[PDB]
DNA sequence: CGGGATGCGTC
DNA sequence: GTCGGACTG
DNA sequence: GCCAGTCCGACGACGCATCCCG
């Protein structure tokens, strides 16, 4: 009983193309609904209608993809390598799944959705060259292409159609959003709208030991900005150049979910188990959002970002590993999403006991008028400290929401810059594609006298601007001047780009500089000297 | 057996 | 993390 | 026209794991 019209991939497809192919999310939701009314398996259709939000790992990408399929089309992979340019490889699958006069495809669409699905557990398994060609050939070799491509999309967690959870979700119940986002598993909200949709003739609850869509900060650019959006006045937190960590605990069970709600690799956690239970005598279930870090043991400080890397924990003699907690979700079986934040920190206090540099408040001073917030905001660029994290006061949990604020010192007007100079290109893939969408910043360097690499850089630029760059730009088309001022919130050290080691923390580009065509854009000692300011 | 590619996941 | 560009009410 | 609240895609540096293939 899965041979019904509604479980054929060729239905899928036709539901994604649709989709696809209509604008406004209000009726994409809306064809979507339709179809799961009138005309088969629920659960897996909104699964596979979300291929990047319920996400497997197929250690697949364009390059290895290309690959293994230039092997069972018994075809030049170099053809495929210029046809990634136009940036699909579903596309560029397809194409090359007729020329195949070796591989053909299949006569008729015959898949059922469960045998793609039961295909994409086994190939998610597989790990070999050898072991991922084959699995791919059997699959393949029942594809209408049209099939073939579609389910590269899937392995690929973009079906290229717009549509994300929400619209997905919504077409489900008007709650299946809200609610996922609170207790974050797919197959238990379906089961919970049909155990409801069964009885005629959807509750929005966190669950204990079940990922919640962690709470967000928006970036916040003026104190006049914060202070219209805290009416009520603020909680102002250090904001921890850490890995945000949701702590689950049951009895003596503790899960630990990341910012992408997959599992904390349990070396940068298997030790709060033994710490915890002292931090919250007589709290048997709880559910906390935190930060981790690498903590310098013998002087207080933490360790900058890179540190928590097994291999850079490994190098310090003096750090484990701390858990600062800024926030409690639920405790003992009952939720505090709705309380206000005011009442959840006094939660908080009235039940942990900080044990030292293990399990830690996180320092959250109230700030209630304008000027006392500004000088915060100066006094902690002061000593580099990353930036703040501003709540509202009377504000609830709300999971997935954009509510909290962040400040740093490149958000307003102050930022770490560089006016670099561009060197090559690369292909921008889908949307952009063909194009050249990302770029290679550089600068020149008297040492060597050759030219020298810090940074690519993609983001800065909108649409109307990349395509009258697509003219303005030399043709370094070798893949075997003009200057640009870029922005970012640090610089980084490491042993890949040219220029000494040095780089930029979230690269973005911001003034298009006319004036300093090279000469007078930064070399590598100028540069070097920037860096060095910033300790 | 060890460098090179490719991919993943954290900001 | 970043950014630019959408659809909604 | 305009908003703000939110999505959606198309992207960076770093640190790391695993498989390849000579």
Redesign the pocket.
């Known amino acids: 009983h899965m041979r019904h019209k509604d479980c054929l991939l060729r239905e899928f497809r036709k539901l994604c193309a649709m989709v696809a192919d209509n604008?406004?999310?209000?009726?994409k939701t809306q064809i979507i609904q339709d179809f799961l009314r009138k005309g088969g398996d629920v659960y897996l259709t909104v699964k596979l209608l979300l291929p990047?939000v319920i996400?497997t790992?197929?250690?697949?990408?364009?390059?290895?993809?290309v690959?293994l399929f230039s092997r069972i089309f018994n075809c030049n992979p170099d053809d495929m390598a210029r046809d990634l340019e136009q940036?699909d490889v579903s596309e560029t699958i397809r194409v090359f799944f007729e020329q195949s006069k070796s591989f053909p495809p299949a006569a008729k669409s015959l898949l059922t959705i469960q045998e793609v699905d039961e295909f994409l557990l086994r190939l998610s398994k597989l790990?070999?060259?050898?072991e991922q060609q084959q699995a791919l050939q059997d699959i393949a070799s029942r594809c209408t292409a049209n099939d073939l491509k579609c389910i590269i999309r899937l392995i690929k967690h973009?079906?290229?159609?717009?549509?994300?959870?929400?619209?997905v979700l919504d077409a489900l119940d008007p709650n299946a959003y809200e609610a996922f986002k609170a207790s974050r598993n797919l197959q238990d909200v379906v089961e919970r709208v049909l155990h409801n949709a069964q009885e005629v003739e959807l509750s929005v609850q966190a669950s204990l030991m079940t990922p919640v869509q962690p709470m967000?900060?928006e970036?916040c650019k003026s104190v006049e900005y914060a202070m219209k959006?805290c009416p009520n006045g603020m909680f102002s937190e250090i904001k921890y150049?850490?890995?945000?960590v949701q702590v689950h605990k049951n009895g003596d069970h503790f899960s630990y979910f990341?910012?992408?709600l997959?599992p904390?690799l349990p070396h940068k956690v298997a030790h709060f188990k033994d710490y915890i239970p002292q931090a919250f005598p007589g709290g048997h279930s709880m559910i906390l959002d935190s930060e981790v870090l690498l903590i310098d043991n013998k002087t207080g400080k933490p360790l900058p970002?890179?540190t928590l890397?097994?291999?850079?924990?490994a190098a310090f003699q003096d750090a484990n590993v701390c858990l600062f907690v800024f926030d409690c979700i639920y405790f003992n079986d009952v939720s505090l999403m709705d309380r206000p934040l005011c009442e959840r920190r006094k939660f908080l206090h009235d039940n942990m006991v900080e044990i030292p540099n293990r399990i830690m408040f996180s320092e959250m001073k109230r700030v209630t008028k304008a000027l006392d917030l500004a000088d915060m905001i100066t006094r902690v660029i002061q000593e580099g400290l990353e930036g703040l994290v501003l709540k509202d006061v009377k504000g609830t949990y709300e999971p997935?929401?954009?509510?909290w604020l962040k400040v740093?010192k490149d958000y307003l007007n102050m930022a770490d810059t560089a006016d670099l100079v561009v060197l090559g290109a690369?292909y921008?893939?889908?949307?952009?594609?063909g194009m050249m969408?990302?770029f290679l910043m550089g600068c020149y360097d008297p040492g060597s006298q050759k030219w020298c690499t810090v940074?690519?850089?993609?983001?800065?630029?909108?649409?109307?601007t990349l395509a009258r760059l697509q003219n303005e730009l030399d043709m370094v088309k070798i893949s075997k001047a003009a200057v640009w001022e870029i922005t970012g919130?640090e610089f980084?050290?490491?042993?890949?780009?040219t220029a000494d080691?040095?780089?930029?923390?979230?690269?973005?580009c911001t003034r298009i500089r006319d004036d300093k065509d090279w000469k007078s854009a930064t070399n590598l000692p100028q540069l070097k000297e920037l860096y060095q300011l910033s300790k």
């Open positions: 604008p406004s999310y209000n009726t990047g996400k790992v197929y250690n697949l990408n364009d390059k290895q993809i690959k940036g790990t070999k060259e050898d973009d079906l290229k159609m717009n549509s994300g959870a929400k619209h967000l900060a970036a959006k150049d850490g890995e945000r990341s910012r992408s997959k904390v970002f890179g890397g097994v291999h850079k924990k997935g929401k954009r509510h740093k690369f921008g893939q889908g949307s952009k594609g969408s990302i940074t690519k850089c993609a983001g800065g630029h909108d649409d109307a919130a980084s050290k490491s042993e890949a780009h080691g040095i780089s930029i923390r979230f690269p973005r």
